[PDB]
């Protein structure tokens, strides 16, 4: 019943995970061999070696994906914010699945404002990912994954804690409205029309 050191989100690491899926992770052989005594750099290694895709659960076997297992280990470890930021930045410039992992993790352990602020600029990232759902492996993208994190109640077979809606933060003026790499809709429309007619003749 006692609580381990709490995440900045305000929720203990155990509760945010569902009993079935986490016990399913613990039972898995892959977890038993690869997840014992793993330093941050070592998890980076396990990532770059063994993760070719992203999902919470796969197949009728309901075997947890290495992505989710390493996510769970990272969850238990509860690393500090600066080093995970540096992690997603560097690893991200080098590789995408590391970014996916860090992003999922931050969505789990961090407060709304922080998550929004750090994740939103990565909507620019278009890098292609393969995602294994309950059925088949559908192709997806980093930006789509981020947007999913922000707008979806359940991601990677893990329920997502109800997040304070962004426009609410807007009206309270704690944060400035999201700005895409592109401008407002109308100016994009006008410049694209103009460019099209100009190129065409």
């Amino acid at each position: 019943g006692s609580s381990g050191p709490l995440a900045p989100n305000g929720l203990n690491p155990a509760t945010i995970m569902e009993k079935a899926v986490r016990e399913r992770i613990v039972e898995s052989y892959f977890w038993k061999e690869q997840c014992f005594g793993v330093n941050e750099a070592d998890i980076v290694d396990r990532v770059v070696e063994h993760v070719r895709f992203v999902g919470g659960v796969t197949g009728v076997t309901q075997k947890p994906s290495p992505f989710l297992c390493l996510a769970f280990k990272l969850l238990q470890l509860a690393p500090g914010d600066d080093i995970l930021k540096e992690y997603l930045y560097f690893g991200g410039e080098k590789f995408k699945y590391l970014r996916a992992l860090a992003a999922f993790y931050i969505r789990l352990t961090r407060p709304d404002k922080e998550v929004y602020t750090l994740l939103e600029p990565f909507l620019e990232d278009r890098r292609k990912l393969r995602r294994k759902g309950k059925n088949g492996t559908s192709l997806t993208y980093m930006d789509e994954f981020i947007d999913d994190l922000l707008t979806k109640d359940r991601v990677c077979s893990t329920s997502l804690w109800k997040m304070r809606r962004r426009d609410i933060l807007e009206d309270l003026d704690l944060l400035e409205p999201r700005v895409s790499p592109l401008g407002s809709l109308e100016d994009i429309l006008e410049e694209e029309e103009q460019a099209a007619k100009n190129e065409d003749g």
């Binding site: 330093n39 941050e40 980076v44 690893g91």
Partner: peptide, 21 residues
Amino acid sequence: TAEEVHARIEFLWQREQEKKK
């Protein structure tokens, strides 16, 4: 902390460069 991760990731990258060779 993060610096160790730096060294590890660099090692990995150089390894990948060696693989591409």
